[PDB]
Ligand SMILES: C=CCCn1cc(C)nc1C(=O)O
Ligand SMILES: [Zn+2]
């Protein structure tokens with residue numbers, strides 16, 4: 001079964017095999033007085049691994065690398081952060097010290113700098129406009145437009161029809177928007193629609209936090225977001 005928040009002490013990381021050569025990583029972290037789970041992705045990239053997002057902090061990200069070495073045994077050589085918040089770049093300095101080349105879009109790198117968060121080394125070109133997509137090893141990177149944040153990316157693994165939605169996608173059980181300080185509530189439903197249009201055959205959809213599901217997570221997130229706009 002998919003690991004849940006109460007099963008992972010802060011500082012430990014679980015790996016979950018989704019398909020051949022595709023894993024999610026699950027960690028936990030405190031935020032505003034509570035502990036939350038958080039998802040990232042690992043994809044086999046030939047003899048190497050591509051990492052999508054840190055495990056939300058330096059300690060968790062170190063545990064992530066150790067679990068990968070123990071369970072998979074291939075080197076993590078590149079990482080992509082899908083926006084500038086700490087559950088996505090927190091741990092970049094550990095990745096860099098371990099030998100991982102870290103990447104994000106120019107906007108994400110800039111917003112991380114403005115926020116005082118860790119900054120991926122390398123800029124991803126070709127993602128500056130809504131609807132832009134680029135290839136990056138075994139995945140496609142997609143910028144759907146502003147949603148959870150103005151810079152948020154999603155990631156598709158064609159070999160397995162896996163869609164990693166990041167924090168722009170909510171889990172089914174999450175019924176309130178919660179913290180949306182950096183969100184663009186007006187654009188978020190439109191951005192979700194671009195994800196739907198671009199990946200209509202996604203069979204496994206991973207939210208930024210919580211249990212994976214299917215394409216139903218997209219309408220579910222629009223429902224939550226629009227309900228927040230009404231009142
Ligand atoms: C779900 C957790 C509560 C709010 N939150 C904190 C962080 C790092 N990320 C989020 C988010 O909503 O994406
Ligand atoms: Zn975020």
Ligand SMILES: [Zn+2]
Nearest residue numbers: 087167208209
């Ligand atoms: Zn988040």
